């Protein structure tokens, strides 16, 4: 049974509610982005309308084999009508194709569902600037002040320099990058670009990246591992055992692996600067955990909410425990008192 924070009152609409079978009353199913906690239950057998971005649509079609007829892509930044209700899709600054959704209810209420986002001050000059929002359905993944992490630009700088230095000292080193979903592509793309290589990967992953409308992508990726010195692998394989095994496969082309695990937050953030980050090493293999986040930091979140001044906030993450809910409502009250709304 579908929970309440996935339902849009005064509409026949749900958001990211595909694991509950047929939801009573739902005339249109919205999908914010192509991550499996959110698309859970879609398949080639789904026959209700799905509304999403063009990219999320390429993925539903090609990866999950949803039929063309049930896929309704919408352009971003554009007023559209769906079963008599005005909507707009906005970029969420999460993974490719990820959107926020503005609903303009027939009674005059205005609702913002952020799906998954990384709040940014550029969002303050979207179509959000031009009117009030009564309810906000907020991604609260890191809604606690201990969640700090650097900018995406800083982390990429750190990775670029790390990889370039290591491979200039040892031309026979291989760089490996872990992945388990879409998102965070900039990590492996930035590294390959500085080394003048394409990124090599499995057929299943090449296919996924082929759906993403990335400019010049045929220039940047490939399925021929041998021609490439940046390889992608499943995140699970990013460990001393997994990498030793992979290295055996490359046929004495390489004598060293430098690998990167993009994580979200990790408690090493509570002590370390991105500049001071050190790998875990065993022999000819080093592994860096880098805090590349696609979710708001606590401060990025707080800033966006104090700017938007919503009348009511409904959290969509960390809702399962009384301690989490209580913690979050305290922070919402603080922000409101501090800013005067
Ligand atoms: Ni997500």
Domains of the chain: 1-147+296-341 (3.60.15.10), 148-295 (3.40.50.12650)
Total Cβ atoms within 10 A of residue 175: 26
Instruction: Give me ligand 1 centre to Cα 235, in Å.
Output: 16
Both tokens of 172, joined, read 């026979």
17: left (phi over 0), alpha (psi -120 to 50) or beta: beta
Instruction: Give me ligand 1 centre to Cα 234, in Å.
Output: 17
Alpha-carbon distance 288 to 279, whole Å?
Answer: 5
Q: What is the resolution of this structure in A?
A: 2.1
Contact between residue 146 and residue 331 where contact means Cβ atoms under 8 Å apart: no
Experimental method: X-ray
Contact between residue 87 and residue 104 where contact means Cβ atoms under 8 Å apart: yes
| Eight-class DSSP state of 132 | -
Instruction: Give me ligand 1 centre to Cα 164, in Å.
Output: 30
Q: 187-219 in b/e burial notation, b at 16+ Cβ within 10 A?
A: bbbbbbbebebbbbbeeebbebbebbebeeeee
Alpha-carbon distance 177 to 166, whole Å?
Answer: 15
Instruction: Give me ligand 1 centre to Cα 114, in Å.
Output: 11
How distant, in Å, are the alpha carbons of 32, 72, 97 from that of 54? 11, 8, 7
Instruction: Give me ligand 1 centre to Cα 256, in Å.
Output: 33
Instruction: Give me ligand 1 centre to Cα 33, in Å.
Output: 7
Report every protein residue that has its C-beta within 5 angstroms of ion ligand 1.
35, 116
Instruction: Give me ligand 1 centre to Cα 39, in Å.
Output: 10
Instruction: Give me ligand 1 centre to Cα 239, in Å.
Output: 24
Instruction: Give me ligand 1 centre to Cα 105, in Å.
Output: 26
Alpha-carbon distance 131 to 120, whole Å?
Answer: 18
Task: Kindly report the length of the chain.
Answer: 341
Instruction: Give me ligand 1 centre to Cα 34, in Å.
Output: 8
Both tokens of 5, joined, read 């924070």
How distant, in Å, are the alpha carbons of 44, 234, 318 from that of 62? 10, 20, 31
Alpha-carbon distance 38 to 316, whole Å?
Answer: 11
Instruction: Give me ligand 1 centre to Cα 337, in Å.
Output: 30
């Amino acid at each position: 049974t579908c929970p309440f924070y996935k339902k849009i009152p005064g509409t026949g609409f749900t958001v990211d509610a595909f694991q509950y079978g047929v939801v009573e009353g739902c005339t249109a199913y919205f999908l914010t982005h192509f991550h499996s906690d959110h698309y859970a239950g879609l398949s080639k057998h789904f026959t209700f309308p799905v509304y999403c971005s063009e990219i999320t649509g390429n993925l539903l079609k090609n990866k999950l084999h949803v039929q063309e007829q049930y896929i309704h892509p919408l352009p971003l930044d554009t007023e559209c009508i769906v079963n008599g209700v005005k909507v707009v899709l906005l970029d969420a600054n999460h993974c490719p194709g990820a959107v926020m959704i503005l609903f303009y209810l027939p009674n005059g209420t205005v609702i913002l569902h952020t799906g998954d986002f990384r709040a940014d001050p550029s969002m303050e000059r979207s179509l959000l600037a031009d009117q009030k929002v009564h309810m906000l359905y907020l991604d609260t993944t890191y809604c606690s002040p201990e969640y700090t992490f650097p900018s995406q630009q800083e982390v990429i700088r750190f990775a670029i320099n790390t990889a370039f230095e290591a491979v200039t000292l040892n031309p026979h080193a291989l760089v490996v990058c872990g992945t388990y979903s879409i998102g965070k592509e900039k990590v492996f793309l930035a590294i390959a670009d500085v080394l003048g290589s394409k990124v090599g990967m499995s057929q299943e992953k090449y296919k996924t990246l082929q759906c993403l409308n990335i400019p010049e992508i045929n220039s940047l990726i490939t399925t021929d591992m041998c021609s490439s010195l940046v390889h992608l692998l499943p995140m699970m394989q990013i460990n001393f055992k997994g990498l030793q095994s992979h290295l055996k496969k490359c046929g004495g082309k390489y004598n060293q692996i430098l690998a990167f695990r993009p994580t979200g937050w990790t408690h090493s953030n509570k002590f370390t600067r991105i500049a001071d980050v050190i790998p875990q090493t065993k022999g000819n293999i080093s592994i860096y955990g880098i805090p590349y986040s696609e979710h708001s930091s606590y401060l990025e979140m707080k800033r966006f909410v104090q700017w938007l001044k919503p009348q009511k906030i409904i959290p969509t993450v960390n809702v399962g425990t009384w301690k989490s809910r209580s913690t979050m409502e305290k922070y919402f009250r603080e922000w409101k008192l501090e800013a005067g709304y």
